[PDB]
């Protein structure tokens, strides 16, 4: 999608393994603000967005 019309896909009822994002070299920038990338596997979230 475009920047003015960004796609908003709500994520729920998942068991996510963030290693497919963190260890992948295909992502040129991995920045987190409220949390740390390595510890995402230890937390449970609702209200998840993308």
């Amino acid at each position: 999608a475009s920047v003015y019309a960004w796609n908003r896909k709500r994520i729920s009822n998942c068991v996510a393994d963030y290693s497919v994002l963190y260890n992948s070299a295909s992502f040129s920038t991995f920045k987190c603000y409220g949390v740390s990338p390595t510890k995402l596997n230890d937390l449970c979230f609702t209200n998840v967005y993308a």
């Binding site: 070299a25 990338p37 390595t38």
Partner: protein
């Protein structure tokens, strides 16, 4: 500490930063004191192929 790394990966060589090259190969302490100095090596460490 002398090493050769990519141009875009120099930002990962900093206190309190993470990355692929910064974990498996060379890890810095968070309270590291000193300097990090780098300069271009394309003219001496690269070939056409």
């Amino acid at each position: 500490d002398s090493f050769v790394i990519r141009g875009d990966e120099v930002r990962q060589i900093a206190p309190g930063q993470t990355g692929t090259i910064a974990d498996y190969n060379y890890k810095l302490p968070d309270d590291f004191t000193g300097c990090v100095i780098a300069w271009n090596s394309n003219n001496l460490d690269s070939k056409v192929g």
